[PDB]
Every structure is written in C-alpha cells, then in structure tokens.
Amino acid sequence: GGSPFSGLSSIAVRSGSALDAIIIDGVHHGGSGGNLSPTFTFGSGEYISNMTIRSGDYIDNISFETNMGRRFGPYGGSGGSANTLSNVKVIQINGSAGDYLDSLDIYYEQY
Amino acid sequence: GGSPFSGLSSIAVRSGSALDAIIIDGVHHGGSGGNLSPTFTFGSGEYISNMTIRSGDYIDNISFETNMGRRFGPYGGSGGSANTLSNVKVIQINGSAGDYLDSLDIYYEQY
C-alpha cells in the first residue's frame, strides 16, 4: 500500500559558468555565487532516467530527463568533459562541496 | 576537494505505536498523527552504519546507529517483526506513505 516516494524528492542548483551549488530537498550544498535554479519537485514514482553531467575539477553542467518526460537543465557552462547516464533510475546524489560543487557521487540502477 | 555530503542529510519521524511519518531533509512522508521526533542532521562523512526496523503491514519502529557513535531511536512501538542492518553504509531511504509509513526501501552498501 501507499504512494511511492524517494529520499531524493526535489532538486535545485546555483550556477554560473560552473556549479556553485546543488540544493537537495531544500538542503544547500555549495556556495552563494551564480543564479538560483527553480526547484524541481519529483512526483510519486518519478525518477531521473537520463542525466548529462559536464565535469572537470568541478561539476560544470547538470541536466536530466525523468521517466515522465520532464526535464531539468542544462544549468551551468560549457567546460569540462561530458558524461551521460542512460536507461537508469537515479537513487542517490552525493558529493563534495565548498564554495562550488567539487564532485558528484551518483547512485543509480543501470537498466 | 570539498567536504563530503549526502542527499540523505537529515531524518525525523512522526510516531505513535507505529510510524506515522518519516521526514527526509524536511520533506514530509506520511500523516499527521503521532508525536514529532527531533531532526537528526548528518555530518560530512557521517552515514547510517547500523539500523533496526520493526515492520508488518506498516513500518512499526525505526532505530539506527551512525559510524560516528551517534544514535537515533527507537521511535514507534513493539509490533511487527524486527530486521537489522549491520556493517552497512545507508545511501538512500525510499518507500510508500499514506496516513502512515507503509513501507521503506533502504539502499545501502553491505560491507
């Protein structure tokens, strides 16, 4: 019984040319620079299915598509190298933050 | 670089004899009954290492120990059956909620 939920229930970012911050369920991870994205709130049974991430020494860009045809991004800049997650169910987003988003540790089901 | 963080950054619950709610990074999952736990905010590099969960048709009790000797619980009641997670790193907490906490879908590293 019940309506499904996730502990990853909403995402925002702060971005300029790179990722200043990620804001996960209203919890700030990073610095104050860049401009604040609007918050993406996930629906019951909705999860991240695609995700493109540009990264270098820092997280430079973040975009994703959900299983419900919804989109978030791109936010950030054109630097670093691009990696893509496809046919996935993203479960967790961890990482390391300072004044910027230094790394991301994504946990997902690889379908 | 950077200080580690998790997308599972704080836990509270609402509990009576069972689990009315779990509150994950300030996002409410469940109903309004029972009494509100105080919020456990996780520190950088802190994660759930032990966890005892009583469950039946509903989540009945929740307790956990973190890798930093910190504790949360027990909260709830004495019904259902007990399961324990030991030598783990909890990564995600999902589930299904209504007026109560119907299920929990825990994602962890089994060490």
Side-chain angles (χ1 to χ4, degrees), chain A residues 37-49:
Chain A
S37 148
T39 325
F40 189 104
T41 307
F42 289 99
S44 285
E46 180 169 28
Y47 53 83
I48 304 167
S49 62

Side-chain angles (χ1 to χ4, degrees), chain A residues 2 9 12 14 19 25 33 37 45-46 48 50 65-66 68 83-85 90-91 93 100-102 106 109:
Chain A
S9 41
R14 293 195 68 89
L19 255 299
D25 312 353
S37 148
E46 180 169 28
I48 304 167
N50 231 316
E65 175 111 17
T66 77
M68 299 270 80
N83 305 314
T84 310
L85 294 182
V90 171
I91 294 299
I93 297 183
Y100 298 89
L101 205 54
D102 292 277
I106 310 294
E109 303 278 359

Side-chain angles (χ1 to χ4, degrees), chain A residues 3 5-7 25 91-92 94-95, chain B residues 5-7 25 91-92 94-95 97:
Chain A
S3 323
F5 72 78
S6 198
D25 312 353
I91 294 299
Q92 196 52 286
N94 297 157
Chain B
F5 72 78
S6 198
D25 312 353
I91 294 299
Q92 196 52 286
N94 297 157

Side-chain angles (χ1 to χ4, degrees), chain A residues 1-9 22 24-25 27 29 89 91-98 101-104 107 109, chain B residues 1-9 22 24-25 27 29 89 91-98 101-104 107 109:
Chain A
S3 323
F5 72 78
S6 198
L8 183 59
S9 41
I22 194 158
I24 285 166
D25 312 353
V27 172
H29 300 291
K89 175 172 174 215
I91 294 299
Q92 196 52 286
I93 297 183
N94 297 157
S96 281
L101 205 54
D102 292 277
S103 38
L104 281 174
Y107 296 82
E109 303 278 359
Chain B
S3 323
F5 72 78
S6 198
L8 183 59
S9 41
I22 194 158
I24 285 166
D25 312 353
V27 172
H29 300 291
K89 175 172 174 215
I91 294 299
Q92 196 52 286
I93 297 183
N94 297 157
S96 281
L101 205 54
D102 292 277
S103 38
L104 281 174
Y107 296 82
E109 303 278 359

